[PDB]
Amino acid sequence: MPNFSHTCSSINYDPDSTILSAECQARDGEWLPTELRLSDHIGNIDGELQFGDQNFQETCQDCRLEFGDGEQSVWLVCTCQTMDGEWKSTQILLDSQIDNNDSQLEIG
Ligand SMILES: OC[C@H]1O[C@H](O[C@H]2[C@@H](O)[C@H](O)[C@@H](CO)O[C@@H]2O)[C@@H](O)[C@@H](O)[C@@H]1O
C-alpha cells in the first residue's frame, strides 16, 4: 500500500545514526519534517538483512540509497559482517509493508 514517496519529498538517510528524514504534507495542507529510525525494525542475521530484527549498522558499513529509472524510489544496500567476520553485500527495498499517514508516520 502507498509509501512516503509521493506523500513526502527530499528523502535523506544519514549512514551513521540511520535516521530517515523527509518533508510530508499534512491533512491541513501544511508541510512538516519527520524523522524515523530503521534500526528499530532492521538487525543483522548471520550476514543477511531482514525486517523484525534490530542493531545492524553496528555490524555493517557503506550503507547507501540508490535511485532507479524513476526518482520515485530509492534502494537500500549495505555490507554486513558475517559471524565468522567476513564482509558480504546484501540488498533490501524499503518500499513494501511501510507507509506514512498524511500527518503521521507509522508502519501499515
Ligand atoms: O551488537 C550486537 C550484535 O549481535 C548479534 O550479531 C552477531 C553476529 O551476527 C555479528 O556478526 C557479530 C559481530 O560482528 O556479533 C554477534 O555474534 C545481532 O543480534 C546484531 O543485531 C547485534 O547488533
How far is 71 from 101, CA to CA, in rounded Å? 21
Q: How far does Cα 84 stand from its chain's mean position?
A: 26
Residue with cell 500527518: 103
Ligand 1, CB cutoff 6 Å, lining residues: 43-44, 46, 53, 55, 58-59, 81, 83
Structural domain spans, the chain: 1-108
What is the rounded distance in angstroms from the CA atom of residue 93 to the CA atom of residue 108?
16
Q: Which atom from ligand 1 is nearest to the alpha carbon of 58?
A: 23
Q: Scanning the structure block, which residue is given the C-alpha cell 519529498?
A: 9
Report the helix count and the strand count for the chain, using DSSP H and E: 0, 8
Instruction: Write the burial class of residue 25 (CB in 10 Å: 0-12 exposed, 13-18 middle, 19+ buried).
Output: middle
d(CA 63, CA 57): 8
**Solved how?**
NMR
| Ligand 1 atom 19: residue of nearest CA | 44
DSSP state of 23: E
**Per this entry, what is the length of the chain?**
108
Å from CA of 82 to ligand 1 middle: 9
CATH for 1-108 (2.30.60.10, 2.10.109.10, 2.60.40.10, 1.20.59.10): 2.30.60.10
